[PDB]
Amino acid sequence: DEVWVVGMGIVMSLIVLAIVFGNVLVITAIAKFERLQTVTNYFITSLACADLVMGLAVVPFGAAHILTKTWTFGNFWCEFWTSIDVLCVTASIETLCVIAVDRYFAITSPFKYQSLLTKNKARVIILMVWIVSGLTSFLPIQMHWYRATHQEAINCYAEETCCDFFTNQAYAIASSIVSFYVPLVIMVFVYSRVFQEAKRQLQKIDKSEGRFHVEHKALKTLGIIMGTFTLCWLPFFIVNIVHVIQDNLIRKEVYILLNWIGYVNSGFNPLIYCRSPDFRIAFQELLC
Ligand SMILES: CN[C@@H]1CCc2c(ccc(O)c2O)[C@H]1O
Predict the structure, then answer these.
(1) Which residues are recorded with the post-translational modification Phosphotyrosine?
(2) Is there a contact between 242 and 194 (Cβ–Cβ < 8 Å)?
(3) CATH code given to domain 3-286
(4) What is the spatial distance between Cα 211 and Cα 231, in angstroms, rounded to a whole number?
(5) How far is the CA of 55 from the centre of ligand 1 (A)?
């Protein structure tokens, strides 16, 4: 049989449909209803836009390349596609970091939260995030600064029917540091402090109203948030660092598999973040 030819296509199409439907529903729900327009919901809008772009562009052409085993399009479109991939991934991760910092400021400083965050300052931050995303994905790739120098890489670059990722040590390390590790450290610190604050509040409530009946929730929420992200993206950004240092340690198929596992995070974000009752009411009004 040829269960590989037809089997993988079904799964890839399902992934594309799930990503597109979820992100479109979130975006149109925020846009149509005036109640949902909040300074917290603009970051979710940027995240959903990045996920929608990735689902429409990065995934279908990668699936076609995998199934056909050749890059039938031009040589220019290979670099265009790589640039869009890197852009979307880094923009999404930094938007997640921005949301985490927003929550940190909301709980930690209750009185001064209103002054720090304003609709004017919630746009400058998003524009800066997207600009920083664009200055690491288009500028180095299109200027041919990431290109490797060895016989297989040179032969891949010369041929017009081969689109594979070969990169330098410097670009790999700098891209990984910019895209993954700094947001990871920021999120770890932020969520640790938020957990401390929640524990202090529970202690105070128990000490005050203990005689009447009157950390499972905090643990469950933080576990979902930080386990649907580290598990999805961490394994890839270790082999990314390793594969340049050691020539034959990491195979080429494991790289692509871990990369595609990383992409799946786009279709999960509406589930993780758009769970408020207002969002459910808006979804119920739109559909059904
Ligand atoms: C071909 N796929 C790319 C390869 C390297 C890379 C990705 C994402 C973010 C980065 O910072 C990267 O360096 C992947 O999406």
Answers:
(1) 113
(2) no
(3) 1.20.1070.10
(4) 42
(5) 15
For ligand 1, is residue 82 a contact (CB within 6 Å)? yes
Cα angle 126, 131, 133; round to 5: 95
Sequence-separated (6 or more) residues with CB below 8 Å from residue 235: 258, 261
- Residue 181 tokens, joined: 């590790």
Tell me the resolution in Å.
3.3
* CA–CA separation, 132 and 118 (whole Å): 21
User: What is the CA(86)–ligand 1 centre distance, in A?
Assistant: 5
Q: Please state the domain extents for the chain.
A: 3-286
| Cα-to-centroid distance, 254 and ligand 1 (Å) | 14
User: Cα–Cα distance between 41 and 30 in angstroms, integer?
Assistant: 8
Closest by CA to 183, choosing from 244, 229, 236, is 229
Q: How was this structure determined?
A: cryo-EM
Determine the Cα–Cα distance for residues 277 and 69; give it in Å rounded to an integer. Answer: 45
Write out the two tokens for 174: 């700098």
* Cα-trace Rg, the chain: 22
Instruction: Report the C-alpha gap between 210 and 77 in whole angstroms.
Output: 65
